[PDB]
């Protein structure tokens, strides 16, 4: 499914959670912040 362009949700705001088309990765604002906070290691994407 997909969200409609309109957001007539009785004033309720989901901006920080709904996907942001601007970012290539459609991670929500909150999810991107979480990823930044986390410090992963060994992604393994054909590492040198």
Ligand X SMILES: *[C@@H]1O[C@H](CO)[C@@H](O[C@@H]2O[C@H](CO)[C@@H](O[C@@H]3O[C@H](CO[C@H]4O[C@H](CO)[C@@H](O)[C@H](O)[C@@H]4O)[C@@H](O)[C@H](O[C@H]4O[C@H](CO)[C@@H](O)[C@H](O)[C@@H]4O)[C@@H]3O)[C@H](O)[C@H]2NC(C)=O)[C@H](O)[C@H]1NC(C)=O
- Residues in the site for ligand X, rule: CB under 6 A? 7, 13, 15
User: What minimum distance in Å lies between the beta carbon of 45 and ligand X?
Assistant: 31
CA distance 23 to 9: 23
Residue of 43, 19, 41 lying closest to 29 (CA atoms): 19
For ligand X, the closer CB: 16 or 34: 16
User: What minimum distance in Å lies between the beta carbon of 48 and ligand X?
Assistant: 37
User: What minimum distance in Å lies between the beta carbon of 11 and ligand X?
Assistant: 6
Beta-carbon-side half-sphere exposure of residue 30 (alpha carbons within 13 Å): 5
């Amino acid at each position: 499914y997909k969200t409609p362009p309109i957001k007539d949700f009785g004033g309720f705001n989901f901006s920080q959670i709904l996907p942001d088309p601007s970012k290539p990765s459609k991670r929500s604002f909150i999810e991107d912040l979480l990823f930044n906070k986390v410090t992963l290691a060994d992604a393994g994407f054909i590492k040198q």
